[PDB]
Paper text:
[name] is a dangerous human pathogen whose segmented negative-stranded RNA genome is replicated and transcribed by a virally-encoded multi-functional polymerase. The interior of the core adopts a right-hand organization that is common to all RNA-dependent RNA polymerases (RdRp) and comprises a palm, a finger, and a thumb domains. The active site cavity is located in the core center at the intersection of four tunnels: the RNA template entry, the nucleotide entry, the template exit, and the product exit tunnels.
(ii) The structure of an isolated apo HTNV-L WT symmetric dimer, that is determined at an overall resolution of 3.0 Å resolution, reveals the location of all domains, including the ENDO and the C-terminal region. The central hubs that promote symmetric dimer A formation are the CTER domains. Of crucial importance is the extreme HTNV-L C-terminal loop containing the residues 2142 to 2151 that swaps into a hydrophobic groove of the opposite CTER, forming specific interactions that notably involve the two last HTNV-L residues F2150 and Y2151. The CTER domains are also involved in stabilizing the different domains that compose the dimer A. The CTER residues 2052–2056 and 2111–2127 from one protomer interact with the ENDO residues 185–204 of the other protomer, leading to a mutual stabilization of these regions. In addition, the lariat residues 2044–2052, together with the mid-link 1905–1907 residues, make hydrophobic interactions with the core residues 1357–1364 and 1513–1514 of the other protomer.
Residue numbers in the entry:
A (entry chain B): 2104 to 2151
B (entry chain A): 1863 to 1949, 2028 to 2151
C (entry chain B): 800 to 896
D (entry chain A): 1621 to 1669
E (entry chain B): 1 to 216
F (entry chain B): 1187 to 1620
G (entry chain A): 1428 to 1475
H (entry chain A): 1283 to 1331
Amino acid sequence: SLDREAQNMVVNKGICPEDVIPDSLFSFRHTMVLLRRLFPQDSISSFY
Amino acid sequence: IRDIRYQAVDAVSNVWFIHKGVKLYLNPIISSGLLENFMKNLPAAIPPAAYSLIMNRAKISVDLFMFNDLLKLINPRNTLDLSGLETGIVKILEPVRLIKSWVSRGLSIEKVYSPVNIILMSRYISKTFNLSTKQVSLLDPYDLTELESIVRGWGECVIDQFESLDREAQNMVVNKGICPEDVIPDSLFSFRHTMVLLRRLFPQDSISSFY
Amino acid sequence: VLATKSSVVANSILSKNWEEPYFSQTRNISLKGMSGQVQEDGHLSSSVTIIEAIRYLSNSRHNPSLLKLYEETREQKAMARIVRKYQRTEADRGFFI
Amino acid sequence: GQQKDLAALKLCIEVWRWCKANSAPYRDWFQALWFEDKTFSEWLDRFCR
Amino acid sequence: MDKYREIHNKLKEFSPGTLTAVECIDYLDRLYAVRHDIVDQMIKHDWSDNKDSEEAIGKVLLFAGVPSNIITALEKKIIPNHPTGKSLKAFFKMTPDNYKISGTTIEFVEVTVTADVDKGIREKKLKYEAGLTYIEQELHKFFLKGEIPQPYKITFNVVAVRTDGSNITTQWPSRRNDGVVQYMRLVQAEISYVREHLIKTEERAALEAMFNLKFN
Amino acid sequence: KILLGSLSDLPGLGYFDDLAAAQSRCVKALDLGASPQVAQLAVALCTSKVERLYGTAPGMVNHPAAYLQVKHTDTPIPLGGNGAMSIMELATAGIGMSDKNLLKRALLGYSHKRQKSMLYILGLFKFLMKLSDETFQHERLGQFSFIGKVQWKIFTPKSEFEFADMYTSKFLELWSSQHVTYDYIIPKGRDNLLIYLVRKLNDPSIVTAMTMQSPLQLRFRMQAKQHMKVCRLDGEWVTFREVLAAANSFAENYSATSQDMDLFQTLTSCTFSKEYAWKDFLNGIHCDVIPTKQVQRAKVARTFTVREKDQIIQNSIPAVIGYKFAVTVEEMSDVLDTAKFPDSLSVDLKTMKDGVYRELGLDISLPDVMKRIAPMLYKSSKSRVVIVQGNVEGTAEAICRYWLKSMSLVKTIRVKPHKEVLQAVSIFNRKEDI
Amino acid sequence: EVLAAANSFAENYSATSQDMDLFQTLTSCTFSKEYAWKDFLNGIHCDV
Amino acid sequence: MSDKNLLKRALLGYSHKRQKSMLYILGLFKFLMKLSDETFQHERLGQFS
């Protein structure tokens, strides 16, 4: 039910994946930098 | 009536004006805090770019054309489709001459450019967003002004020398990782504002980013 | 007498800062009187140091140093004149410009 | 609060009078111009209320 | 070399936009020093001359058998073609990057790494060749007067390598171009990272001004 | 020479500026060897002359008491003020120290009990500041210190000087706002230096100095004597009575604000330069007559410095301020050229911010905050030479003590607090301690 | 010991802008409407 | 209210002139506050001020 609601919410109108707040103690910047540092990604794919 | 705070006036949408068939764009006047001077026929100082934006507003600036050339150099077929041209009671009878009396040279807010960050961010914008979908001629002038402001001067630093700059950017990005949210093309750049502006101008199906 | 103080003399001469721009110093943009250019009637014009500095900056393409300014205006003939209105400034001492 | 309301009313008066003297889009401007944290049309509605 | 390793170790622990302008400047200076050192080392191993410490021109001539008395006598002379009128003693004090002695022929080479090959070449020429040619005439006159049994031959060669190492093989047809160009590409990427990303956005103008004053 | 030249010349820049010029050159005459009594007589004569010329004195139209509900002594000097200060305070403390003392007293009165006569003075000062923040910001930089002042008309054409009419006034104002670093440092490149010189040429003080001995100056004197439009109230030319009425109207309906209190304290608080506390020194001083015959010694010239520079800041305050305000590459190059220790500029700026945060709740990180607070914190470091009689040591305390002993023309004077009562104090006091 | 510690802390105490603001917060007015009894009593006069 | 009056007088004395006997009272009050900020915060809420 939650997945269907999420699909309904995201398909009809656009959602920017930098404003989604999963909980009151979430920071997009910190979480993403932590995940970048833990799991490296080849930056060539994002720039080439 | 006295103590009128014209300086506190802000504009959100387009503020147009007509005079004897001449179309005027008063948003730069309001943003520069010169609404009182325009209304009451008082002298003021504006840069030539603001004058060009106010008078015409229908011909894109040379900065947007240079950015289009840069995007063509990076990756053609993903460029902006360009079809426009280049470059108590007070009564106003000569608003055009009034604005021309404000034009002068040297009062331009130049910014510190970063030659490699410019090309990196240009290619990030090229790949992330599809710029060959919506005609720029029918775009909102209010948003086109802000895009031109945030892209102003990018072409002047990379078109003349591109191959060396592109090779340096590749060298910098291939060896060690670069996060495309810390690249600062110039001192007057905000990632959040630029990206939200580009999202609103060019919609993207959010299903692809979430499914 | 001067041969026993060669090091300090050299230091003092080099500390005059001959490499700084000529018109960036206060003494060359002051209000002291200065002769202008020859007018049409043939009389030298009484002017001010700041006005002459502005004139040279407008005509020139850069702010030259003392040595560079001397080299540029080496061929220029020296001219002098007596002030129109005497004194006119607390820092104006003399009778010639 | 009264001072801010007075300033907003006076500024709306001035812009309205200027638009009256010339030929200007009254309502379009009133939906465009912004003062403090309330747009001009909302200021008009608050003045009516 | 190990200097590059130390620089990389110091700079992988710095988050983007957290370096003061002066720190960026001195890190860049260290990086240019490392690039110059690695090019000096490639030439070192190419000529197989294990002269780890640079030696002065007077010391090089001493290694060539030149008597000290004539050098001392010439130290009092002045270069007529020197742009700044520097004395021969100071020109003997300075140490070239590398040297080689082969009989009566001595080869002096100055190496610089820059994008503008012609500008660096002409700068090194106006810095070295005037004094080198003056010394050449002095030793030729000494040979004519009979204080040396054999005349000396001096040769100055300046080679500038671009930041990408495209023409390094053309100027230096060495066997070791690949490793050196790979290392110099790495250090160029490091320099670009330091100058363009790690600098605080509030001090980019300060970095630009300091770079212009120091290098331009 | 200075005493007799203090009379004929009219600066014509307004009541406050003419009074300040007369008082400052009377102080200079005192420095050259004038007795404090003769200097006081000259100060009184020049004050009377300027008051009559501007109508400030009680008995004619421009008297502030007829248009303000505040005492004549308590009115700010830019308005109808009483410039009858002692020559001691003028020479030691400064010229605009009366306004500083008045503001300090007003803030002290506002605390403890909340009256209206003192908030009236606060409103008058706020009105003066509002008037001041409508012209070039570099006017407050340098020259005599002031919280705010009324601007007066310039009765001379701008076409007299050849290059004045090259950049428009609005051009100069917007260039000054955009390039604030050039208020503290002199530009090097010609592109900015030419605009700097054109702005300098249009300065009213410099214009008057250039037209000081010309018949054109009688225009301003006749306009002022006839009580015509000579001052500014908003974008219009107004008479001094209108300025007084507007000041009364603004002060009667002025509400105190926490940020306004902080800024008033910023004005009242210590300075970036080590300043001696002359007010409490003079208040707590005592002089005693010793029955000894006067002995005429020789004359020696000593350097009397009142404002020094903190040794912790390796660079000059203008250099650091300009470096902070510089945003363009060429501004940065200019400030690096001017600064003697470019590598320590960041350290000096950090210490400056830390000291400001320690002594004040204001943070200089915001460009507006530092822009507003810099002129009221940094003051010039001009040095003076004072002619003294005997063994006066080359310290400000010694020169002041010599002046105290010189009050009596015949009787020998002894100062009871003969110890060192120097108060060299700056914003930076606990930085080393912390 | 408390008195001695108070003396030791007060003899070497340096005033701070934030401390001044907090002291004024204590001295300033209250969230509840309070009558100024101090100035009322200071300015009062009683006659027999 | 005695403590409040004492603190008000101490702050008034600290202004105008910077003595040490009044900064001594300020330091005493700061020491009292430091002692107070080591127990339950709701103790200051309610009861005597």
